[PDB]
Design a protein around this ligand. Structure first.
Ligand code: NDP
Ligand code: EHZ
Ligand code: SF4
Ligand code: SF4
Ligand code: ZN
Lengths: 198, 114, 41, 6, 50, 118, 340, 386, 112, 174, 145
């Protein structure tokens, strides 16, 4: 059993209401989950406003952006779930603000609020395809220069569709449709028996 | 229906942007074939540009067209500044790969699953 | 001597899952599915 | 030096 | 295992005893903050400054 | 202000899939049945859509199975039939949904079989 | 004996052609192994060059597709084991300079016979033998005549053995195109008859290769003597200048009697290390391309020839200078075509 | 293009693979646009297709200079999701090898920094000490680096019978080895010049660009996630964070040499106070059963078979757990469905943020300055590219 | 008085009490436009009023640093004007208004 | 607890001291002394072929399949070594041997795919697949690196004596 | 269940017998759950399999060795949750996590029973039933598996 300190669960819950009241407009759900982490969920339009309040509020200074990520729940209408994890060196706490973005409904960029996001937002576009308005220079960071398709999307094949080899005839590296010599063995692992939720 | 717009409010405005990109690429094809010493013909390349710009001619929705050129503009910026090299440009031409026939009889003669 | 016998594979932890074989019928020498060792009642 | 025994 | 003279050349040139540490190994409502503000760290007593 | 589009979100043009695997790939939306081997039903809950199976030729050097189809091992899981159908339409893959078939209620009572009559 | 063809068509797929290819290390060869490997065919490449040189061929073949065997032409046993398990044998053995220990007969007629001879003993389904174009048993160049001698013999050792007969080949690393371009070192570029009356029809190497490969996988070709030729003929004059044109180096065609010139070839021939020109080469260079009246090669075997000007830029680029290295073929003027 | 010049992927100066498309007016850098992904390999997508225990080896490869410290971050994360915590001895171990690993990273960062600067003898001096440390890894895990020792429920196997004594002899001496490097670089009349006042980063700007590492600590911001948010038993030890002022390449360096010193203080303690006990949770549910038990008890075989073949089956949830990896804050955001294989695992790499800062650090700087600044960020392209 | 603040970039601000009193009084002023029962106005007004009450009350900066935390006094100055900037920004943003739109159904259901 | 790594009168004595440091390069000479010192230390290198860097029993090294003393190969094809391999390296297909027992017809470890995690060593119930001590198996051709059952069984027979000693030393720990 | 065992005592063993050429009864595995004796009487009318004896050596096997010959026979495999009696042809060719499962239709007989074809690396390894209330409700014939 982990050493939970209820002292935290309460204080972070209380801040979650604080933020919910301060910004009734964009906060949809706030919840301090077990594991004692607070996640304020905001409408995509509240990206700029909710972050700024956290970066510049005396009672909630959240100066650095730990991470910007986008889980992809294909079932969810709004496929991506942009998650921003922020740290507060003054109150030694962490909060996560998560929004929802569909493939062709872009989110605002927070490079203004935190310049850390300049790179992570490019990372989210390259892997998942979400677009960030007002971004200084959005362009693929991790994928190859000519890569077609957004890789971390759940609908993208792991091996992908193209692989590279050197061809003598043309004396230059050349893509070809992927041909694998031992396909990824897809072990089915889920057990047909559940675990009675505690 | 009822969808928030990305860059243009209507296909019309969007098409304006496509025109600009076409021009951009059209003006650029020659330079690339020279700064990358590619073994292709400017005319040939310019047709390729046309190919791509039409491969996606069917799109009717304004939002889809806007992101397509968003992608398109970054493509030429890497094409320019020679970030893409000869190998990443020539890939567009699918030069090494053997073309596959689409004739039924052809496929029957070769692949189990067409 | 016994009706049933074990088969650590020899060496316990270094052998195999311990299995008890029924050498109950001389008709058949039990064979631990792991060592292929036949046991003669 | 896996085993100090020759 | 090095002549003391050569060894000395080492200690002298170095300025400390390598013999002791050799290279050859041998055998209304209150405004609520997220958490109480962090107490500023104490100066290290054993060496505040290097 | 929002703009109006009656066009079925098709984003086949943005997904980045090779043309061959968007027009020749049929995916089936089905709720997985239960290996008769086990009696647990926790794997017959969520709908899954699976792309059509393709060539698996033997490899000459080692005899390992080899596949040329990228979308083979991909099985996406969707909570409801409506959402899975939506994924096929906007991605442009053909779909053939199979209705969930759940075990019919069966009446059982220990006393009933003790009936010598029947 | 066969291998059902499974796969999608690229590397890591199977086509069922196990093929010994004795002279693969060659310029043509390199290409033959390329397609055979691309298709997924089993390729056995006999080699007598050192392992370091054979490395370039390893990468185009997929894992286990390419097998390399040590082989000596004088030793009959080496050819024997190479064709043991092959069902297709392709012979590209050839040279331009009669070497100390191998005569034109050997490289063209003697060896290529023993090879097909064994291939039959083995039971290979088909043998493809390659001999130079316009090869009369009476042609001036010992080379061409000797090659002619071979195409006959091998028939008797191996009946119904395809005999593709390519023209001088155009390709990167070829001689036809590079040789002339390399005349730059020579201040003047001698051209017999001032490069006239020796109309020549080049053929891209790949076209030749693809053609050859297609032969291996087609029943229509048996006893066929195809002639891969090209998409356009040329008087040697335009060819020479054109080359110099793309190379962007001046041209001074200079008439010099073939009589005296055969002597220049003799001079280089004298050199120990791979003579650059050959008395025979000289003659061959002037031997006018013959017109086509034989079994069609390219197109007939399935590949449409590729014009010289199209890929010339790639072959002649290395010969340009610091700036000339950036010029492209379409701003350049393409030379006229003389069918004669 | 102001003579745009790719720093080039193959360059001894560029760690691993870095194309820095730089436009330089003569020898002055006007703008640095680092390119990344030359080492993207898919680590984040691959993990979704693997079970929790078979994704542990990926973390060692994410930033392999710091082989284990990275594991601890996934461990902690998977333990939180399961609400299981490791046994007391395992915790101390992880702090023991956690610190040894910090030294290993700093010996790399300080000595590799010098090799690019041009000082080559410090690298050979300390790579011998590194070597000796690797041997600890090997005699504990089996692998010199890429151990897989710290697993989600504790460590894998107790320390060999005798390691602690040797992690002492070494520690007892390593100091002098750090001291030597010093007599060679800390006050060199020349190290200072190429390092001092190069890449100064303000305090407000460092927090803004998410630097979170020595890079923050060097600017004088006091933040060590190990003291602010204790993980494992780094709470029971006593160490001094080496904060810096006049943050610049030289100051941060001094900080990295000082944490090498402070880690020896933490290692000493761990050797002095490591408890008798078990090294893995006793819940066969999460930790694999001992091999004597699985070969004599049915419940243990069933638990061994299911654990290795299927997996932990972590309860559904999501967590961001960050430790203080030698480079900086290493965090794993591990979203998890009830399944045995994860759903997402964004690895926060101290390094994605640091590289981004290269632009705002190397401004109006010479070609040699860029080489010095890539060194003062300890960029391991594995963590950045993931 | 001090020589310099720990943070590299920050510079010692002389007359710190005066600088804070200026910024604190300004914010209070801007907040005066926020809607009356607006949550941000009531909450921040409470925080800012306590801050300057302490700033006016304490004439020693070292004890002032202890009373409202803030580490060095210079930081507190940066935090106050950062808040002053956001107070101006939120008036434009109008966060006090009702929720933009409800999340789509099942958008926040994690078990999936 | 924090510490200031670099946080900081002019007297002739002081200045003259400082000026001498710049003028006659005093600290630079200090650095030369350190390197001269080591020049006199014994070098730590080992003759690689003649002397080998020490590896203790848990070293993973090269894969081998063990056999029971009697001579019956240990593997019983449960195939969970395949299940837990992180890289998909091990490929196993099995069928009942005529004896009726269960054995693997094909066991192929692709060593180029393998990342030598050592979990297979961990997972095997009969402990048939073990991480053998040898690390020197560099091969001229890629195909040689792919290993079938016969190479691994042969590898097992060659190194069985040391593998048995190594497992003997470390089994109590596991 | 439980993380560990406390049965420090010895185990029992029963004697493997022959129930036929399709079902391999390694019945030392049996948890005496009597689903076989039911199916073999209720779903199929064989009424042969039965319990024999009392105590901890109740073994659920035919008293005399008479093979369980009937159609519907192979279902016992699928219905015994323990692996005591399993299929003899598919003895040790595979292991279930690997098997890719494609849902298809029985063509051997005209009832068109629903079935799942379990394929590994491209050759079918087993065909087991998948439930169709109306056509085959969890059972398939001895021929079509
Ligand atoms: N443009 C052209 O080159 C034309 C060629 N041809 C014919 O096509 C064939 C292929 O041409 P190309 O590849 O250019 O010829 P090359 O000069 O490249 O030689 C072909 C191969 O034959 C091998 N070889 C040469 N002599 C011997 C020998 N004595 N014993 C064993 N092997 C030998 C060489 O291997 P190694 O060097 O390792 O000994 C080489 O790899 C030739 O035989 C030629 O007659 C026909 C028309 C035009
Ligand atoms: C040789 C150089 C290589 C350069 C290749 C290049 O970078 C790659 C490329 O062009 S990427 C093409 C994608 N470009 C679009 O997708 C624009 C789509 N634009 C629309 O769809 C319009 O909205 C409209 C409906 C009016 C089209 O109607 P119309 O028939 O064109 O009139
Ligand atoms: S685990 Fe050990 S025994 Fe079971 S298969 Fe893999 S190797 Fe053979
Ligand atoms: S069903 Fe399987 S387990 Fe239950 S009794 Fe019959 S055999 Fe034993
Ligand atoms: Zn046994």
């Amino acid at each position: 059993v982990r050493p939970r300190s209820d002292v935290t669960h309460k204080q972070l819950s209380a801040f979650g209401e604080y933020v919910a009241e301060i910004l009734p407009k964009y906060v949809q759900q706030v919840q301090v989950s077990c594991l004692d982490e607070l996640e304020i969920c905001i409408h995509p339009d509240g990206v700029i406003p909710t972050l700024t309040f956290l970066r510049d509020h005396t009672n909630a200074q959240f100066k650095s952006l730990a991470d910007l990520t986008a889980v992809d729940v294909p079932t969810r209408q709004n496929r991506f779930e942009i998650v921003y994890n922020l740290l507060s060196l003054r109150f030694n706490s962490r909060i996560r603000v998560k929004t929802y973005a569909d493939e062709l409904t872009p989110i605002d960029s927070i490079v203004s609020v935190h310049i850390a996001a300049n790179w992570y937002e490019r990372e989210v576009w390259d892997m998942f395809g979400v677009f960030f308005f007002n971004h200084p220079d959005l362009r693929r960071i991790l994928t190859d220069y000519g890569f077609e398709g957004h890789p971390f999307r759940k609908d993208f094949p792991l091996t992908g569709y193209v692989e590279l080899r050197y061809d003598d005839e043309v004396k230059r590296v050349v893509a070809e449709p992927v041909e694998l010599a031992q396909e990824f063995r897809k072990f089915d692992l889920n057990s047909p028996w559940e675990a009675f939720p505690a | 229906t009822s969808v928030k717009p990305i860059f243009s409010r209507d296909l019309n405005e969007a098409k304006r942007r496509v025109r600009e990109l076409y021009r951009a690429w059209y003006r650029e094809v020659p330079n690339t074939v020279h700064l990358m010493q590619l073994d292709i013909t400017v005319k040939q390349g310019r047709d390729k540009v046309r190919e791509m710009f039409m491969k996606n001619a069917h799109v009717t929705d304004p939002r889809v067209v806007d992101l397509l050129v968003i992608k398109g503009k970054m493509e030429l910026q890497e094409t320019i500044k020679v970030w893409k090299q000869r190998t990443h440009v020539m890939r567009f031409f699918h030069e090494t790969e053997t073309p596959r026939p689409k004739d039924f009889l052809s496929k029957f003669y070769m692949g189990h699953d067409p | 001597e016994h009706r049933i016998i074990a088969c650590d594979g020899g060496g316990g932890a270094l052998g195999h899952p311990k299995v008890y074989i029924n050498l109950d019928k001389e008709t058949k020498t039990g064979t631990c599915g792991y060592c292929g060792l036949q046991f003669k009642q | 030096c896996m085993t100090d025994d020759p | 295992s090095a002549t003391r003279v050569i060894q000395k050349l080492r200690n002298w040139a170095s300025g400390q005893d390598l013999q002791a540490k050799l290279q050859l190994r041998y055998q209304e409502k209150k405004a609520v903050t997220p958490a109480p503000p962090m107490k500023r760290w104490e100066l290290s007593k054993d060496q505040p400054y290097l | 202000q929002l703009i109006t589009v009656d066009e079925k979100l098709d984003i086949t043009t943005l997904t980045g899939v090779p043309e061959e695997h968007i027009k020749t790939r049929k995916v089936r939306i089905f709720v997985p049945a239960r290996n008769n081997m086990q009696s647990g039903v926790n794997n017959t809950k969520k709908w899954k859509m699976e792309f059509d199976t393709r060539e698996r030729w033997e490899n000459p050097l080692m005899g390992w199975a080899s596949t040329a189809d990228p979308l083979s091992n991909m099985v996406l899981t969707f909570s409801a039939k409506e959402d899975a159908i939506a994924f096929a339409e906007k991605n442009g893959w053909s779909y053939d949904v199979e209705e969930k078939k759940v075990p019919k209620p069966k009446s059982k009572s220990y006393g009933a079989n003790f009936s010598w009559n029947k | 004996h066969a291998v059902i063809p499974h796969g999608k068509g690229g590397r890591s797929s199977v086509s069922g052609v196990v093929a010994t290819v004795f002279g693969a290390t060659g310029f043509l060869g390199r290409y033959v192994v390329n397609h055979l490997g691309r298709m997924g065919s089993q390729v056995i490449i006999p080699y007598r060059c050192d392992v370091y040189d054979i490395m370039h061929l390893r990468l185009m073949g997929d894992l286990g597709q390419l097998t390399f065997l040590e082989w000596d032409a004088r030793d009959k046993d080496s050819i024997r084991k190479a064709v043991q398990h092959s069902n297709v044998v392709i012979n590209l053995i050839g040279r331009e300079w009669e070497t100390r220990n191998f005569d034109f007969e050997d490289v063209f007629v003697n060896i290529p016979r023993a090879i097909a001879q064994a291939s039959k003993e083995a039971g290979v389904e088909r043998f493809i033998h390659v001999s130079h174009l316009n090869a009369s048993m009476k042609s001036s160049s010992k080379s061409l005549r000797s090659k002619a001698v071979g195409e006959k013999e091998v028939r008797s050792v191996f009946p119904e053995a395809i005999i593709i007969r390519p023209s001088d080949i155009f390709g990167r690393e070829d001689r036809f195109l590079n040789h002339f371009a390399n005349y730059r070192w020579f201040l003047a570029v001698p051209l017999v008859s001032l490069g006239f009356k020796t109309v020549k029809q080049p053929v891209y190497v790949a076209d030749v290769s693809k053609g050859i490969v297609n032969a291996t996988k087609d029943p229509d070709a048996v006893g066929k003597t195809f002639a891969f030729t090209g998409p356009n003929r040329y008087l040697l004059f335009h060819l020479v200048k054109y080359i110099f044109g793309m190379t962007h180096r001046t041209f001074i065609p200079y008439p010099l009697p073939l009589f005296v010139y055969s002597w220049i070839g003799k001079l280089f021939g004298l050199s120990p290390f791979e003579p650059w020109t050959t008395k025979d080469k000289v003659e061959r260079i002037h031997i006018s391309d013959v017109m086509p009246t034989d079994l069609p090669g390219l197109e007939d075997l399935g590949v449409q020839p590729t014009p010289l000007e199209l890929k010339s830029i790639e072959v002649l680029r290395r010969h340009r200078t610091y700036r000339w290295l950036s010029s492209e073929i379409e701003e350049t003027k393409p030379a006229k075509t003389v069918n004669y | 293009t102001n003579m745009t010049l790719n720093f080039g992927p193959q360059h001894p100066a560029a760690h691993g693979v870095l194309r820095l498309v730089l436009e330089l007016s003569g020898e002055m850098v006007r703008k640095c646009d680092p390119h990344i992904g030359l080492l993207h390999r898919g680590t984040e997508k691959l993990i979704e297709y693997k079970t929790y225990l078979q994704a542990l080896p990926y973390f060692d490869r994410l930033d392999y200079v710091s082989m284990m410290c990275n594991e601890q971050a996934y461990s902690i994360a998977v333990e939180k999701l399961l609400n299981i915590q490791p046994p007391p001895r395992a915790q101390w171990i992880r702090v023991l090898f956690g610190e040894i690993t910090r030294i290993l990273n700093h010996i790399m960062a300080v000595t590799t920094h010098a090799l690019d600067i041009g000082a080559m003898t410090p690298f050979f001096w300390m790579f011998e000490e590194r070597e000796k440390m690797f041997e600890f890894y090997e005699r504990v895990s089996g692998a010199r680096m890429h151990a897989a020792y710290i697993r989600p429920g504790g460590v894998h196997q107790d320390l060999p019978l005798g390691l602690l004594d040797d992690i002492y002899e070494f520690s007892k001496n390593f100091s002098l080895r750090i001291d030597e490097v010093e007599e060679m670089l800390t006050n060199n009349r020349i190290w200072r010049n190429r390092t001092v006042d190069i890449g100064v980063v303000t305090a407000e700007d460092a927090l803004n660009y998410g630097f979170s590492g020595v890079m923050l600590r060097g600017s004088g911001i006091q933040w060590d996630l190990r003291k602010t948010q204790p993980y494992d038993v780094y709470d029971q030890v006593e160490f001094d964070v080496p904060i810096g002022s006049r943050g610049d390449c030289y100051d941060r360096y001094l900080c990295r040499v000082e944490e090498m010193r402070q880690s020896l203080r933490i290692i000493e303690q761990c050797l002095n106070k490591m408890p008798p006990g078990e090294i893995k949770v006793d819940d066969a549910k999460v930790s694999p059963p001992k091999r004597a038990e699985m070969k004599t008890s049915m419940e243990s075989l069933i638990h061994h078979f299911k654990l290795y073949t299927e997996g932990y089956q972590v309860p559904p949830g999501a967590t961001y757990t960050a430790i203080e990896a030698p480079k900086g804050e290493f965090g794993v955001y591990l979203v998890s469905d009830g399944s045995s294989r994860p759903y997402r695992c964004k690895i926060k790499a101290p390094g994605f943020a640091h590289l981004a800062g290269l632009d705002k650090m190397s401004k109006g700087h010479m070609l040699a300055d860029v080489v010095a600044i890539i060194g003062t960020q300890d960029i391991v392209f594995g963590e950045i590219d993931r | 008085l001090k020589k310099t603040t720990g943070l590299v970039g920050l510079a010692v601000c002389d007359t710190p009490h005066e600088r804070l009193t200026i910024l604190y009084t300004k914010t209070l002023d801007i907040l005066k436009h926020f809607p009356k029962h607006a949550a941000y106005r009531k909450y921040t007004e409470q925080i800012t009023n306590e801050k300057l009450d302490m700033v006016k009350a304490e004439p020693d900066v070292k004890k002032l640093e202890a009373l409202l935390q803030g580490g060095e006094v210079e930081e507190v100055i940066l935090q106050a004007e950062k808040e002053l900037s956001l107070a101006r920004k939120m008036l434009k943003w109008k966060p006090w208004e009702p929720l933009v739109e409800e999340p789509p159904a099942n958008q926040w259901k994690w078990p999936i | 607890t924090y510490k200031y790594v670099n946080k900081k009168e002019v007297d002739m004595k002081s200045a003259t001291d400082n000026a001498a440091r710049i003028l006659m390069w005093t600290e630079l000479i200090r650095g030369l002394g350190m390197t001269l010192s080591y020049l006199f230390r014994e070098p730590a290198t080992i003759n690689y072929p003649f002397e080998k860097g020490p590896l203790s029993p848990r070293f993973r090294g090269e894969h081998a399949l063990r056999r029971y003393p009697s001579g019956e190969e240990r593997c019983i094809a449960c195939k969970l070594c395949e299940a837990i391999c992180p890289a998909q390296a091990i490929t196993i297909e099995a069928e009942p041997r005529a004896d009726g027992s269960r054995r693997t017809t094909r066991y192929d470890i692709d060593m180029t795919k393998c990342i030598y995690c050592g979990f297979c060593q961990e997972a095997c119930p009969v402990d048939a697949i073990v991480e053998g001590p040898n690390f020197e198996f560099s091969t001229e051709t890629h195909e040689e690196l792919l290993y079938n059952k016969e190479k691994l069984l042969n590898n097992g027979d060659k190194w069985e004596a040391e593998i048995a000693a190594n497992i003997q030393a470390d089994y109590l720990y596991r | 269940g439980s993380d560990r065992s406390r049965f420090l005592e010895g185990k029992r063993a029963v004697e493997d017998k022959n129930i036929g050429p399709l079902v391999k009864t390694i019945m030392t595995r049996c948890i005496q759950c009597t689903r076989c004796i039911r199916f073999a009487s209720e779903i199929a009318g064989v009424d042969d399999l039965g319990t024999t004896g009392r105590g901890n050596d109740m073994q659920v096997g035919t008293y005399i060795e008479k093979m369980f010959m009937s159609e519907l026979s192979g279902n016992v495999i699928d219905i015994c949750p323990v692996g005591a009696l399993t299929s003899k042809p598919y003895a040790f060719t595979a292991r279930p996590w690997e098997t890719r499962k494609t849902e298809s239709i029985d063509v051997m007989d005209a009832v068109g029973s629903n079935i799942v074809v379990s394929t590994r690396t491209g050759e079918v390894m087993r065909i087991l039933p998948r439930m169709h209330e109306d056509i085959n409700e969890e059972w398939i014939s001895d021929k079509t598996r």
